Design a protein around this ligand. Sequence first.
Ligand SMILES: *C/C=C(C)/C=C/C=C(C)/C=C/C1=C(C)CCCC1(C)C
Ligand SMILES: *C/C=C(C)/C=C/C=C(C)/C=C/C1=C(C)CCCC1(C)C
Ligand SMILES: *C/C=C(C)/C=C/C=C(C)/C=C/C1=C(C)CCCC1(C)C
Lengths: 230, 230, 230
Amino acid sequence: AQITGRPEWIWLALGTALMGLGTLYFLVKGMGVSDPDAKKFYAITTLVPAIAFTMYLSMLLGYGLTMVPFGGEQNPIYWARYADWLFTTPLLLLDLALLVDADQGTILALVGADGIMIGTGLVGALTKVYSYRFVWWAISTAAMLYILYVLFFGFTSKAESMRPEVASTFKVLRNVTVVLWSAYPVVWLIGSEGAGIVPLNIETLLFMVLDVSAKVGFGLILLRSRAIFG
Amino acid sequence: AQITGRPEWIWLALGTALMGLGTLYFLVKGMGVSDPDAKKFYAITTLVPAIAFTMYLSMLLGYGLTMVPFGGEQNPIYWARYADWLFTTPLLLLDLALLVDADQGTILALVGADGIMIGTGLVGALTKVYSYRFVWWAISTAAMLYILYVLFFGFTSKAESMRPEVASTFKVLRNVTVVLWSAYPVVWLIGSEGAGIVPLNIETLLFMVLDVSAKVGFGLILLRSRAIFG
Amino acid sequence: AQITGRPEWIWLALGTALMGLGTLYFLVKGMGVSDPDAKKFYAITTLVPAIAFTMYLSMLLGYGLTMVPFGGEQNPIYWARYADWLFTTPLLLLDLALLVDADQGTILALVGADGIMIGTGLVGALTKVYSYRFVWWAISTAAMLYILYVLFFGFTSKAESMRPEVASTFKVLRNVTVVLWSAYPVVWLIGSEGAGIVPLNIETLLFMVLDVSAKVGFGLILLRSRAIFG
Ligand SMILES: *C/C=C(C)/C=C/C=C(C)/C=C/C1=C(C)CCCC1(C)C
Ligand SMILES: *C/C=C(C)/C=C/C=C(C)/C=C/C1=C(C)CCCC1(C)C
Ligand SMILES: *C/C=C(C)/C=C/C=C(C)/C=C/C1=C(C)CCCC1(C)C
């Protein structure tokens, strides 16, 4: 065993306990419900932290870390996150979409949009030759800007519901979504092994807070909200 | 060529001939049908053995085998199965769901559930350091228990249909599902390279019987059954 | 940087500028539309070239190339294409299906069909030992023949619509689909590193023309067509 040495551990393990406990609680809240509309929402959320948990575990001890060398050294990146964020994200965006009640097409484009967002991101990470890395970085973030756009501009404009509650609750979700996410790109550029300005300890710290707050928080106000009645 | 040496070959090749021939027959049974409800079911099944076939081939000669070293040696695991079971399974569970006629949400959670079940399993396999291997092993099997639960408890409770036939046929499918699957976990722990108690020859034997019986058998009683009328 | 040496570059870079510019234009055409039926189609297309673009980039400079050694040497294959064609294709087939208006089941089988088509193809590429390579090659192409069959025979027979326009437009799409695709298999066998008869320069040339013409062309006549009204 070696779940020590690499300082980041404390941080990882933290994100872990939080994720697992979360999926567990939502797990309960869902139990038996004439909620099928909501039940749908529930299943989605529950799954989200679930994944984040498994991933975080691998990332902690064995899996998740490689040694992408760029610029002139051996960098330790945690690809694992690329996977977890990958599945977790299309699901999330889906949660919002349904909540507001969009349309296959709209959601469809949004899904593929994210897929390329993260996917490309990853490709950059492993890319080596830090210069090209940042290049791919540009592509990905661009995609991100597109999804955000459709979120407020598109969804809000639809966000009209007969129910003031549904309308408000959504607004909050779309907002928090915007802020937290934006952080993701920025942090990765200056931090992690790319610009190499922010140490790995703090880098893992920030990233972590982002995960728990986004998945667990978002999912919480959402389910607890009268949006998924019952 | 080297489709010899490794004794398991005879077993693999066996699973192969069985898989291919199967997908072929179902292939026929489906041909032209005002069955679209059933036609749906058909397409699903047919696909299932199809995949199992391709995979089994790779696994036989070239692809499918690595050398995950743990405990203190070089172990020969057939990751290929991890892939085949991966796609095949979400499909299967889907076949049941529709047959009984559930609801997006329910099926949704079940899908992600399996995904994590197998996925995590794999991660364990490659993990190295046999101790941690078993750890991931625990996580996966847990997920399995969850899916089974929803199957009988949840589906059976719904399994109510106006048609006694549909109700019974299902019952049988859910049952065989339970038994065969349970075998999968157990066998992998004591057998394969983890506990290293069951030789690879017999390990490949048992696993094989499990595949053919599950995919081909399940699919057979199902289609042949009046459930997918026409 | 090394976006030179390997001659193919000029060709790759070409496919690139074409892909990106394409996704950009369709991007516009879609903008704001009471078209949701069509809007659906739009989103699909747009996504298609988008992917092709990102992939083509990686393939150009860093990602996309390995060194699968078979026959008796070190061969340079561009796996990247395997990925791009992978996602792009199920989407395309979906575009056709909806246009004509099929049924979940039919489309479903078609989707899994393609998945295995390309997937297996790839497996062959990396396979090593050129003999076995061609073997997998046979499997894949077979699958291809199946999809084509359902396309004209199945879809055309359904292609009946009340709208002569919809009926014709489709016909054209299914046709071009047939020809271009057939090229794909042939070229890869004689060309690329397998038979080693067609040089890599020309091999990249032909493959390229195939991509741009198929994705961009198909998508063009389609959207511009009154099929996706609005
Ligand atoms: C915990 C999972 C969440 C909600 C995922 C967040 C991450 C993003 C969608 C951000 C993606 C990135 C970019 C925009 C470009 C650079 C690389 C990434 C992956 C950090
Ligand atoms: C032929 C394909 C089938 C129906 C797949 C069966 C396998 C399972 C879903 C079992 C999964 C496992 C665990 C529960 C934990 C240990 C590792 C696995 C993959 C054997
Ligand atoms: C640009 C993307 C498109 C539409 C993809 C085209 C490729 C095919 C579906 C062809 C597949 C192949 C075979 C039939 C067997 C040999 C290997 C492939 C991948 C070239």
